[PDB]
Unconditional design. Structure first.
Ligand SMILES: Nc1ncnc2c1nc(Br)n2[C@H](O)[C@H](O)[C@H](O)CCOP(=O)(O)OP(=O)(O)OC[C@@H]1O[C@@H](O)[C@@H](O)[C@@H]1O
Ligand SMILES: Nc1ncnc2c1nc(Br)n2[C@H](O)[C@H](O)[C@H](O)CCOP(=O)(O)OP(=O)(O)OC[C@@H]1O[C@@H](O)[C@@H](O)[C@@H]1O
Lengths: 476, 284, 88, 19
């Protein structure tokens, strides 16, 4: 709390609208709203000055200014639980290295073995109890047994509301390590209901927040079940397209990072899941899939996800544009008349690509086939895409085994890894056997010793010296 | 184990016509005689029907109606100018030229099941207008409030204690020149309502036949819906109505209301509000 | 039935607490109709405590009512007045 | 016995163009 309040404002900075454009459009009995949309007669609430040369109109570049952030601390959501949750306020141009350093060192989070991403539509939706319990149990189990980050949105409506709901469901029992399902949230600062009770310079420590639904306009309220929030600035009042670019950049930079524990190094795997999105999910799914993320679309209660599920295993290019139009004309009653003849083309092309690559794309099949606890389905799709990656020198085998040992699920190791891909001379399992012994994993050492590694070998002078160096650093 | 096996034993062991409806209910309100049952199949007049024998509906006091007191049509004393104005008693209907037979005006919607004087004042159609004041329900900031689907409309409604139901401030237009005075004399002032009549120029939502429980085969009710809307809440007609209140003379309170599916109103009196929902993109 | 001011929620919960079936409360009432700020369950929490209903107090305390709050001077005075009328 | 009955409860509950 002493070295944290220092490492925030003089490196992280916030955007503001210096220039004083008047109101071209006045909306909802307000004249203070001027283009960007903050208060005061000018565009923003800053000093009413000519602001250098009085060039007509403003440019999101010429007239957006970056100054040090003044809002940060530990948000407490009134009487709705006493947990104290961190929050910071950032802008467009902050390199992902700064946020990663803050989140790993200053905030106290640990580097995850998996980055599960939750992106979905924001129109409120209601779904059947069976699929509801399946999703909750699967998400909580896969995100608790691997110590993964659950980065998602910070709103209180939609899929992110569902994941807040699932985190609450976990905290209901909380058999051990209740505060371990850390869920960083990403949302726009410019659209928050009670955000004026958070602007306090040089430390807004326990700044109480009040949430009130059906008291806003189009703006959004914060959630109460998440663990961390990162809010982005643009010096704008009612836009929703600023969190997605930064979130994609940060999520890409996270997977670049490598975790090295026990002597085996892996780059953090990165998975995506979607639930009934809208127009922007066909951004996020494409943007994720082109990179190589195992996007996992779920069949059931879907405006967009159900479309991929329906057109999923039907082979590529066997679908016509008119066929896609008639597919879309049976699911979108509210706006079935406001769909332009060009809106079909974008969706046709993107569905074409996504469904064309079925190695990366994976359909859940809620209850038909593969209807497990979702955790193993996500892990199975992730290892499918990892198997689909490039490998020249028998590297897929070792990488998949290293990743399985990095997690703590032996069922995956025996039912996907150790059953298939041939070869695996017993000397090959030695490097990961060391990590299994070091991290105290008895199930994996039993399995490896079953496959053929002999305790008569593998205990070398060098190996013993290595093991004694990495002895448990809490021992007499 | 014993508890787990029991649920498992249990598991193994177990394995639209649009015709008027309210006007057709039995037990005519506050009338000991019951109306003859007419099914939806034969409700229209043109449809085949062979068992017609309804008791002649008789109002408690048909003489004081100031219209034809003829509960029974033995003496056709009434001279109704069909499709024309007859002076004190209106004989012009918004629906249009209806079928006339034996001197008794036939209900255009169909056979309600009871023919006679009815609770309606005048023999034949009775005209009314139902005014409604609609504004967007506002939060503390004053912006339009959102539900999940669409806006909220804020509507003022008034109930009297005896009704045990809520209804719009509308009544039978006894004066031909100035309807609102008799329509809402217990609401405004008649001076503030003279001002309201001067301001009585709004938007026409619905006009046509109305489904009402009093509807006999002779007398029916058709309504006119005017909706005045407020764009801003800083000034103007809102404060004009706030200062334009003499409802404290008698009756219960006059109150603003939200537009919702479970809002307490008469069964089809709220169909006018449901139609008004389309006026400004309302969530029901 | 008719309800203007979020009365259906409170009425259904009051009726469920009036009966002694928690399955109905969790599978019909407490699962649906949204909203239910944890302060809303306070009036029926008093009746649940007074009538000695441990299942309902567990369920309410699960939904968010904090024992740190809801014990007010007025509430405590009310509870001591309605103490079991068969006690030493 | 307790472990054997659980999987059994689970079992009963579950049941190209070239351009
Ligand atoms: N927290 C919110 N985020 C995005 N929009 C929001 C949010 N709150 C509200 Br209020 N709205 C508005 O509704 C938008 O104007 C929608 O158009 C309205 C309908 O919602 P949807 O159309 O169903 O969903 P998308 O438009 O596709 O946006 C998916 C995004 O992309 C992901 O990366 C995630 O950052 C988001 O979920
Ligand atoms: N949508 C409705 N509109 C008017 N009446 C209705 C409606 N639905 C029903 Br069902 N009714 C019946 O009338 C009730 O059963 C009452 O028993 C009847 C009157 O008793 P009230 O309820 O006390 O008074 P209102 O209903 O509020 O209005 C009546 C006015 O007063 C009279 O002189 C008449 O000239 C005016 O129509």
């Amino acid at each position: 709390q002493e070295s944290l309040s220092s490492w925030i404002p003089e490196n992280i900075k916030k955007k503001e609208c210096v220039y004083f454009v008047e109101s071209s459009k006045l909306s909802d009995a307000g004249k203070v709203v001027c283009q960007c949309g903050y208060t005061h007669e000018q565009h923003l609430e800053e000093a009413t000055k000519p602001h250098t040369f009085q060039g007509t109109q403003w440019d999101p570049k010429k007239h957006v200014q970056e100054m040090p952030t003044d809002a940060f601390g530990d948000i407490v959501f009134t009487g709705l639980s006493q947990k104290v949750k961190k929050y910071v306020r950032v802008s467009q141009d902050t390199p992902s290295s700064v946020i990663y350093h803050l989140m790993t060192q200053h905030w106290g989070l640990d580097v995850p073995n998996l980055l599960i991403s939750v992106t979905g539509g924001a129109k409120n939706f209601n779904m059947k109890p069976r699929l509801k319990s399946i999703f909750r149990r699967g998400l909580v189990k896969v995100a608790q047994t691997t110590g993964a980050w659950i980065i998602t949105g910070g709103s209180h409506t939609g899929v992110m509301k569902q994941v807040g709901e699932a985190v609450r469901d976990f905290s209901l029992s909380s058999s051990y390590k209740e505060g371990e399902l850390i869920t960083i949230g990403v949302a726009t600062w410019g659209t928050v209901h009670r955000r004026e009770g958070l602007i306090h310079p040089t430390g807004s420590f326990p700044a109480e927040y009040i949430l009130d639904e059906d008291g806003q306009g189009n703006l959004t309220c914060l959630d109460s079940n998440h663990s961390h929030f990162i809010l982005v600035d643009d010096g704008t009042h009612g836009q929703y397209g600023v969190e997605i670019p930064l979130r994609t950049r940060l999520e890409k930079f996270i997977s670049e990072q490598t975790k090295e524990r026990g002597g085996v190094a892996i780059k953090i795997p990165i998975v995506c899941v979607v639930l009934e999105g809208g127009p922007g999910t066909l951004h996020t799914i494409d943007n994720a899939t082109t990179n190589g993320t195992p996007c996992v679309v779920v069949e059931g209660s879907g405006r967009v996800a159900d479309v991929i599920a329906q057109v999923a295993n039907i082979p590529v290019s066997d679908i016509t544009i008119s066929l896609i139009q008639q597919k879309l004309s049976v699911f979108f009653q509210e706006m079935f008349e406001t769909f332009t003849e060009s809106r079909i083309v974008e969706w046709t092309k993107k569905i074409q690509d996504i469904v064309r690559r079925r190695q990366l794309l994976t359909v859940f099949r809620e209850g038909k086939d593969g209807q497990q606890d979702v955790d193993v389905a996500i892990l199975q799709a992730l290892l499918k895409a990892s198997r689909s990656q490039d490998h020249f020198g028998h590297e897929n085998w070792d990488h998949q085994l290293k990743l399985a040992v990095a997690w703590n699920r032996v069922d995956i190791a025996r039912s996907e890894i150790f059953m298939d891909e041939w070869q695996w001379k017993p000397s090959d399992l030695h490097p990961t056997m060391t990590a299994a012994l070091i991290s105290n994993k008895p199930e994996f050492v039993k399995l490896f010793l079953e496959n053929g590694v002999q305790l008569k070998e593998f205990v070398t002078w060098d190996t013993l010296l290595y093991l004694y160096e990495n002895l448990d650093p809490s021992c007499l | 184990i014993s508890n787990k096996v029991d649920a498992m034993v249990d598991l193994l062991d177990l394995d639209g016509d649009s015709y008027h409806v309210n006007a057709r209910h039995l037990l005519y309100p506050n009338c000991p005689v019951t109306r003859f049952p007419v099914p939806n199949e034969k409700v229209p007049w043109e449809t085949e029907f062979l068992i017609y024998d309804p008791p002649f509906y008789t109002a408690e006091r048909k003489d004081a109606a100031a219209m034809d007191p003829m509960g029974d049509t033995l003496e056709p004393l009434s001279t109704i100018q069909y499709n024309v104005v007859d002076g004190l008693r209106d004989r012009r209907s918004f629906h249009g030229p209806y079928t006339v037979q034996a001197g008794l005006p036939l209900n255009p919607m169909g056979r309600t099941g009871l023919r006679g004087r009815g609770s309606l004042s005048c023999f034949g159609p009775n005209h009314t207008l139902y005014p409604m004041v609609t504004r967007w329900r506002r939060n503390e900031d004053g912006a339009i409030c959102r539900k999940s689907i669409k806006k909220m409309l804020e509507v003022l409604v008034v109930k009297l204690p005896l009704s045990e139901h809520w209804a719009l401030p509308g009544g039978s237009r006894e004066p031909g020149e100035m309807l609102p005075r008799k329509l809402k004399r217990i609401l405004r002032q008649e001076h503030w309502p003279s001002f309201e009549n001067l301001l009585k120029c709004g938007m026409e939502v619905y006009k046509g036949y109305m489904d009402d429980p009093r509807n006999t085969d002779n007398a029916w009710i058709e309504t006119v819906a005017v909706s005045v809307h407020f764009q801003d809440q800083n000034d103007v007609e809102l404060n004009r109505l706030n200062s334009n209140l003499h409802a404290c003379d008698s009756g219960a309170s006059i109150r603003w209301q939200v537009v919702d599916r479970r809002i307490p109103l008469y069964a089809n009196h709220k169909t006018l509000l449901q139609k008004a929902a389309a006026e400004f993109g309302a969530h029901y």
